[PDB]
C-alpha cells in the first residue's frame, strides 16, 4: 500500500504545515501537525478542557463506531518550545492520504498549553519520530508508520515541504517526479529516538565549504534551523546590522536586508538553502527589525535540521530495518 497527502503552510511565514488526516467511522478529518521529531498522534477532542479550545477541529470518540477506550492509559508530553498537552488514549482507524492503519492510538487531549490553544489552524500533532519515543503509560503506543510499515510498498516516507506554498508527506514510495539530480542517503542513530544524522559540513552565501561534522536531527515539527553558535555567528556576520536580540529570543537582522544563502552538506552532496527562506518576517506587526530562519542550538542540547532546512530539499525518511535519511535538491 502508499498513501499521499497535501501539506499547507498554516500562515505566510511557514511556521508550520498541517495535513488532513481521517480518524474514526464516519470519518472525522482533523488537520494535523506531522512532526517527525516526536511520537505520538494526539488530537484536540470533545474531552478537551473547554476554555483551553478555540476554533479547532475536535474529534468525537462517542460518534465513531470503531473507537474503543484504551483502558487505563495516558499520555503528557513536553515539547521543546515549552508547549505541552496530555490525557487519555482511544484506538480508532486513522487514514492518511489513503493508507489506512487499524488500530492506531489516539491520544485524546484533556489539557493542551497555551500556544496550542492560541493556533487555530492545528488540530493535534502526527508523530513520526521512533515509537520509543511515545509517551503513553503503561504500554507504549507504536507511531503511524510504525503501524503501517509492514503494509507499505517500501518502508518510507518522504517529506516535500514547500516555501510559502503546499507540499506532499508520502508514505510508501519515493516520488522520483519530485525532485532533481540523485538522492544522497546518510546514516541515522536511533539512540535518543529521533531521526538523527550528521551534515558534513555548511557554506554561507556563495563562501567556500566548511567541512566539519554537525549532528542533529531532521524535525518537521520545528520551524527553523537551529545549529551551533559559531555557524550561526557566522551565518548573521554576512547580514549588515544583524545581532543577537537576548530580548527577543535570537537573532534579528534589518528588513531591509537581502539574506545571504545557506548550504549544508549531506556526505558529498549540498542542499542549498535560499536567503528567503530564512527571513521570517518582522518581529512584531509593523516592525523594521525581521527574525531570522537560522538561530543558536545552544542550550537546547541538540542541532535541528527543522522545516527552513527541509523544505529546500526532497527528504526520505527511510524506516528499514537500518534506518537512513536521504536528501535531494528540488
Same mark, same amino acid.
Request: proline share 4%; glycine share 12%.
Given at each position: 500500500?502508499? =498513501? ?12 508550520? @504545515? ?27 477532542? +470533545? ?10 477541529? #475536535? !474529534?468525537? /470518540? ?6 474503543? &477506550? &484504551? ?14 498537552? +496530555? ?8 487514514? $492518511? ?27 493535534? &500533532? ?47 514510495? %519515493?516520488?522520483?517526479?519530485? !525532485?532533481?539530480?540523485?538522492?544522497? @542517503? ?15 559540513? @555548511? ?10 561534522? #554537525? ?5 518537521? =515539527?520545528?520551524?527553523?534551523? !537551529?545549529? /551551533? ?20 529570543? =535570537? @537573532? ?6 537581502? &539574506? /545571504?544563502?545557506?548550504?549544508?552538506? $549531506? ?5 542549498? #538553502? ?7 518576517? /518582522?518581529?512584531?506587526?509593523? +516592525? ?5 530562519? %537560522?538561530? +543558536?542550538?545552544?542550550?537546547?542540547? %541538540? ?11 526532497? $527528504? ?15
Amino acid at each position: 500500500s502508499t =498513501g499521499s497527502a497535501t501539506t499547507t503552510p498554516i500562515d505566510s511565514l511557514d511556521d508550520a @504545515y498541517i495535513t488532513p488526516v481521517q480518524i474514526g467511522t464516519p470519518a472525522q478529518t482533523l488537520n494535523l501537525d506531522f512532526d517527525t521529531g516526536s511520537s505520538d498522534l494526539w488530537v484536540f477532542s +470533545s474531552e478537551t478542557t473547554a476554555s483551553e479550545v478555540d476554533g479547532q477541529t #475536535i !474529534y468525537t /470518540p462517542s460518534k465513531s463506531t470503531t473507537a474503543k &477506550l &484504551l483502558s487505563g492509559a495516558t499520555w503528557s508530553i513536553s515539547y521543546g518550545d515549552g508547549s505541552s498537552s +496530555s490525557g487519555d488514549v482511544y484506538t480508532d482507524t486513522v487514514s $492518511v492520504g489513503g493508507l489506512t492503519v487499524t488500530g492506531q492510538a489516539v491520544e485524546s487531549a484533556k489539557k493542551v498549553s497555551s500556544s496550542f490553544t492560541e493556533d487555530s489552524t492545528i488540530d493535534g &500533532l502526527l508523530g513520526l519520530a521512533f515509537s520509543t519515543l511515545n509517551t503513553v503509560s503503561p504500554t507504549q503506543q507504536k507511531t503511524f508508520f510504525d503501524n503501517a510499515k509492514a503494509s507499505l510498498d517500501s518502508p518510507v516516507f518522504t517529506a516535500d515541504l514547500g516555501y510559502h506554498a503546499p507540499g506532499t508527506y508520502n508514505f510508501g514510495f %519515493i516520488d522520483t517526479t519530485a !525532485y532533481t539530480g540523485s538522492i544522497t @542517503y546518510t546514516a541515522v542513530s536511533t539512540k535518543q529516538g529521533f531521526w538523527e544524522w550528521t551534515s558534513t559540513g @555548511y557554506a554561507v552565501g556563495s563562501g567556500t565549504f566548511k567541512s566539519t561534522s #554537525i549532528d542533529g536531527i531532521a524535525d518537521t =515539527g520545528t520551524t527553523l534551523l !537551529y545549529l /551551533p553558535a559559531t555557524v550561526v555567528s557566522a551565518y548573521w556576520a554576512q547580514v549588515s546590522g544583524a545581532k543577537s536580540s537576548s530580548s527577543v529570543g =535570537g @537573532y534579528v537582522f534589518p528588513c531591509s536586508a537581502t &539574506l /545571504p544563502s545557506f548550504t549544508f552538506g $549531506v556526505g558529498s552532496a549540498r542542499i542549498v #538553502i535560499p536567503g528567503d527562506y530564512i527571513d521570517f518576517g /518582522p518581529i512584531s506587526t509593523g +516592525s523594521s527589525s525581521c527574525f531570522g530562519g %537560522i538561530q +543558536s542550538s545552544a542550550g537546547i542540547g %541538540i542541532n535541528i535540521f527543522g522545516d527552513v532546512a527541509l523544505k529546500a530539499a526532497f $527528504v526520505v525518511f527511510n524506516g528499514a530495518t537500518t534506518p537512513t535519511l536521504g536528501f535531494a535538491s528540488k
